[PDB]
Amino acid sequence: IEERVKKIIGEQLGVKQEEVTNNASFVEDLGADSLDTVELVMALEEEFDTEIPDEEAEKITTVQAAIDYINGHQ
Amino acid sequence: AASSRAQVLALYRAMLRESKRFSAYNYRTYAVRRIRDAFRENKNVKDPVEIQTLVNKAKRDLGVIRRQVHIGQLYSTDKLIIEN
Amino acid sequence: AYHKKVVDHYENPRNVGSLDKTSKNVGTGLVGAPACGDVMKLQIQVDEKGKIVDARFKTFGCGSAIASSSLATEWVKGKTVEEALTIKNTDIAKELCLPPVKLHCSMLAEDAIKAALADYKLKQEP
Amino acid sequence: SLRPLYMDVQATTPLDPRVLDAMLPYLINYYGNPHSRTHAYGWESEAAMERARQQVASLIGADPREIIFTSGATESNNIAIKGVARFYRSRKKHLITTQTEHKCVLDSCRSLEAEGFQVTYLPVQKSGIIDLKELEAAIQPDTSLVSVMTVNNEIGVKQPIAEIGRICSSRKVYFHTDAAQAVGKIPLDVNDMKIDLMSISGHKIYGPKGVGAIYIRRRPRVRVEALQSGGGQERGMRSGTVPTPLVVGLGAACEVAQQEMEYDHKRISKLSERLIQNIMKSLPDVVMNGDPKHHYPGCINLSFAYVEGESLLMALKDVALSSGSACTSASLEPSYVLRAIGTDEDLAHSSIRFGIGRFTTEEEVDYTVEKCIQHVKRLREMSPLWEMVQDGIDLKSIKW
Numbered sequence: 301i302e303e304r305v306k307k308i309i310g311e312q313l314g315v316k317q318e319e320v321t322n323n324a325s326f327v328e329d330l331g332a333d334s335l336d337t338v339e340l341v342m343a344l345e346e347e348f349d350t351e352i353p354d355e356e357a358e359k360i361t362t363v364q365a366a367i368d369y370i371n372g373h374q
Numbered sequence: 375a376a377s378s379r380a381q382v383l384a385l386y387r388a389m390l391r392e393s394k395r396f397s398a399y400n401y402r403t404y405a406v407r408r409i410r411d412a413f414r415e416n417k418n419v420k421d422p423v424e425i426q427t428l429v430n431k432a433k434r435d436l437g438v439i440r441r442q443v444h445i446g447q448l449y450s451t452d453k454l455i456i457e458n
Numbered sequence: 459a460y461h462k463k464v465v466d467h468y469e470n471p472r473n474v475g476s477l478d479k480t481s482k483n484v485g486t487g488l489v490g491a492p493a494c495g496d497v498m499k500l501q502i503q504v505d506e507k508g509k510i511v512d513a514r515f516k517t518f519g520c521g522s523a524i525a526s527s528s529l530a531t532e533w534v535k536g537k538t539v540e541e542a543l544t545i546k547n548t549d550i551a552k553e554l555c556l557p558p559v560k561l562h563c564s565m566l567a568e569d570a571i572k573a574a575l576a577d578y579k580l581k582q583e584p
Numbered sequence: 585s586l587r588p589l590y591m592d593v594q595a596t597t598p599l600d601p602r603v604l605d606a607m608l609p610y611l612i613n614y615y616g617n618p619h620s621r622t623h624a625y626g627w628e629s630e631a632a633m634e635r636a637r638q639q640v641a642s643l644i645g646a647d648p649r650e651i652i653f654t655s656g657a658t659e660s661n662n663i664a665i666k667g668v669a670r671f672y673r674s675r676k677k678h679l680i681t682t683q684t685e686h687k688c689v690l691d692s693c694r695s696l697e698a699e700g701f702q703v704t705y706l707p708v709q710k711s712g713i714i715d716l717k718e719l720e721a722a723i724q725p726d727t728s729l730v731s732v733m734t735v736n737n738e739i740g741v742k743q744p745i746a747e748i749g750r751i752c753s754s755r756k757v758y759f760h761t762d763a764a765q766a767v768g769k770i771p772l773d774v775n776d777m778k779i780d781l782m783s784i785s786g787h788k789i790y791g792p793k794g795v796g797a798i799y800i801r802r803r804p805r806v807r808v809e810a811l812q813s814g815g816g817q818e819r820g821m822r823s824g825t826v827p828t829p830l831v832v833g834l835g836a837a838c839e840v841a842q843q844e845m846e847y848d849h850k851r852i853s854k855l856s857e858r859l860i861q862n863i864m865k866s867l868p869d870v871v872m873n874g875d876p877k878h879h880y881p882g883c884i885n886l887s888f889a890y891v892e893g894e895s896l897l898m899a900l901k902d903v904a905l906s907s908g909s910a911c912t913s914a915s916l917e918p919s920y921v922l923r924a925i926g927t928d929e930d931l932a933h934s935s936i937r938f939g940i941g942r943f944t945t946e947e948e949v950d951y952t953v954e955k956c957i958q959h960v961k962r963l964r965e966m967s968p969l970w971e972m973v974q975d976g977i978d979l980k981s982i983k984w
């Protein structure tokens with residue numbers, strides 16, 4: 301399932317899959333800092349063989365935003 | 375004045391993306407790990423002058439990584455047993 | 459160890475094991491010394507017509523020692539006791555393409571054959 | 585086909601990419617002879633040489649004037665041992681070293697014995713560490729030099745260099761240490777340790793092969809008779825064209841090691857503990873050679889009873905390892921280092937060396953451990969010594 305987005309986010313952020321909810325902000329809800337979110341964006345790029353440029357990466361601040369970006373880029 | 379934070383997060387991304395192109399396993403895995411460890415270790419520095427020194431070193435090292443990635447692609451070799 | 463022929467006797471082991479020392483039809487040669495880094499145990503099983511019908515080995519040693527004794531164990535099978543007596547270190551070394559610094563391995567393997575064959579002959583005298 | 589893991593950093597290291605990057609300008613456009621005094625190819629080559637000299641000096645706490653470039657630690661050891669002995673030969677004829685030194689120290693001392701010098705080769709304890717009070721007792725009135733290496737290349741044991749320097753300083757005996765395996769890996773300060781001469785190798789610290797240095801203390805002035813005659817380069821101590829790219833590489837490796845030393849030591853310590861503890865909890869009769877309390881974690885020497893070390897290296901076909909030594913008499917004739925610490929001869933035939941370094945990964949360690957466990961078990965099942973001990977035979981009772 302493209303919600304493999306949840307697996308990456310939990311892996312990257314060290315949070316049980318239970319806590320990785322569609323509503324959550326990486327920083328406010330899951331304890332990420334901006335070094336984590338750089339790496340998290342890169343892990344999504346690697347996982348889905350997709351290129352996420354800065355203006356798009358800047359908008360990907362929540363679990364759903366990551367799910368929606370990946371779904372809309374094949 | 376340039377933003378140290380903008381510079382720092384953009385160097386972080388560039389340095390990680392470029393290091394991932396190292397053809398050789400031991401340089402690639404070292405560079406990615408070392409960059410991650412060094413930015414994290416220096417996350418709480420507050421002196422604007424020391425930060426700028428760290429940024430300048432990171433820019434120097436990004437040049438090193440770019441040049442050495444390309445040289446290691448010109449003279450690449452087989453992968454290690456464990457990349458299988 | 460580097461030669462394909464030598465490494466093959468470790469990667470594709472054959473005849474590793476033991477025979478029953480108490481058998482009148484089993485001869486056991488144990489040659490070498492732990493302090494010299496090379497100890498070979500070679501056992502032969504001889505049928506009543508004097509044909510060696512089975513053999514087993516164990517070796518503590520570098521790859522060429524393992525290969526020399528493994529080869530020796532293959533080679534004694536199907537030979538009579540008198541035939542196996544003529545296997546030479548130089549045959550083992552040529553077959554494995556041993557370098558000069560490992561020629562001592564093939565000499566110990568020939569010692570192991572003759573030790574095993576002599577223990578067997580000792581047992582037949584009564 | 586696929587390449588083996590490199591776990592052999594005591595034999596040599598890969599170049600750090602930062603070091604190759606610093607060297608390459610001098611391999612391409614800055615190719616001048618640093619002794620060419622009349623033009624800019626010479627001037628820029630000389631300036632790079634002198635910057636590299638300061639980088640080496642800064643790592644060890646020296647003045648750059650005390651740094652002499654050489655072709656490697658072998659040459660530096662020859663200069664320190666033969667050069668000191670020959671300089672004071674008319675007054676002093678006795679030298680002291682240890683039985684576990686590298687062959688270039690031992691062979692240098694042997695050649696001086698053929699020259700009429702007296703050499704004491706000190707024993708070491710079973711830990712691999714010298715006995716300081718035996719060193720003290722060995723110093724004679726005509727003792728010109730003590731030489732004791734900082735980290736042993738086969739078993740990784742650390743000699744008490746600062747305490748040795750205290751002994752030698754207080755008796756006005758020159759103290760040399762072969763630091764080839766320690767420079768850039770543990771802290772070295774020539775003044776706190778009271779070192780008079782020190783050997784350095786570029787390719788033990790992610791720098792290029794073919795280059796080294798010797799530290800020669802200038803206050804109090806240590807006197808050395810030069811071995812390489814020639815045009816007087818390196819203050820008359822080492823004639824020959826200074827090879828700019830190599831010395832640039834050596835200085836870059838020293839500066840990188842100065843920055844990275846603490847981070848590397850923490851990472852290698854963790855990987856080293858993991859390798860040792862996971863092998864030992866999965867295999868019986870595994871012994872570490874050398875005292876773990878006084879030990880550089882990146883050099884791990886273990887014996888695996890009932891298995892011969894070269895067959896284990898063959899079995900570990902996708903890991904580059906060694907049985908120690910000058911890449912020579914390691915398992916061929918048994919290690920003289922293992923013999924000097926009292927290892928049984930058969931167990932010295934059963935020992936192998938693992939090296940963990942700056943670029944080693946946790947996955948490489950785990951792969952090596954897993955394969956070592958599998959193949960030690962396999963080789964034991966092929967071993968007549970294991971079969972005998974399993975049948976309850978005492979091997980010390982057989983007539984071999």
Ligand SMILES: *P(=O)(O)OCC(C)(C)[C@@H](O)C(=O)NCCC(=O)NCCSC(=O)CCCCCCCCCCC
Pocket residue numbers: 333334335378379382383405408409412413416417418419420425428429431432435439601602
């Ligand atoms: P985010 O959580 O909003 O912010 C993250 C940062 C770090 C930007 C934030 O915490 C901050 O601004 N901190 C202030 C201090 C600071 O900027 N620290 C970072 C300075 S730059 C740095 O540390 C780079 C170190 C470079 C090491 C490279 C290693 C190269 C190896 C290559 C070898 C082949």
Ligand SMILES: C#CC[C@H](NCc1c(COP(=O)(O)O)cnc(C)c1O)C(=O)O
Pocket residue numbers: 594595596655656657658659686688733735736737738762763764765784785786787794795796908909910911
């Ligand atoms: C080199 C190598 C192998 C290593 N020991 C060698 C080394 C040397 C020799 O230095 P160079 O001449 O620059 O090569 C001198 N002293 C010490 C302590 C070491 O380690 C090994 O494989 O054991």
Ligand SMILES: O=C(O)CN(CCN(CC(=O)O)CC(=O)O)CC(=O)O
Pocket residue numbers: 394395399402403406407453456457458947
């Ligand atoms: O980022 C890293 O740690 C390095 N590598 C992982 C190293 N790989 C080897 C490979 O990619 O062939 C791991 C492995 O296969 O062991 C990432 C990448 O491929 O870009």
